[PDB]
């Protein structure tokens, strides 16, 4: 509350560390469905169904341009990518499995880096 604060967590490295995590996601072999925005002209249903498209390249641009106020808003966009993927793709598909693998990969990096 006013003039009553928890001890100040050092957040000065968060930007760099989220960048490294994102690099590692970008270079994972199963990243291919998530590297670029889904092409809304060429993928019937996507525009109407997925209200908030997100992809790694869009996260990278947001990150590099100071559009994440904190590390939680960054994790929310990463998770959005996988939530979208689950919304549109059957679990038993290459893309569906890619999404599950990437989300696991992400969540471990996230825990190990920050928890």
From Swiss-Prot:
Residues 9-113 form the Bromo domain. Expressed at varying levels in several tissues, whereas a smaller transcript was expressed specifically in testis. It is found in: Nucleus. Regulatory subunit of the ATP-dependent BRF-1 and BRF-5 ISWI chromatin remodeling complexes, which form ordered nucleosome arrays on chromatin and facilitate access to DNA during DNA-templated processes such as DNA replication, transcription, and repair. Both complexes regulate the spacing of nucleosomes along the chromatin and have the ability to slide mononucleosomes to the center of a DNA template. The BRF-1 ISWI chromatin remodeling complex has a lower ATP hydrolysis rate than the BRF-5 ISWI chromatin remodeling complex. Component of the BRF-1 ISWI chromatin remodeling complex, at least composed of SMARCA1 and BAZ2B, which regulates the spacing of histone octamers on the DNA template to facilitate access to DNA. Within the BRF-1 ISWI chromatin remodeling complex interacts with SMARCA1; the interaction is direct. Component of the BRF-5 ISWI chromatin remodeling complex, at least composed of SMARCA5/SNF2H and BAZ2B, which regulates the spacing of histone octamers on the DNA template to facilitate access to DNA. Belongs to the WAL family. This is Bromodomain adjacent to zinc finger domain protein 2B. The lineage of its organism: Eukaryota, Metazoa, Chordata, Craniata, Vertebrata.
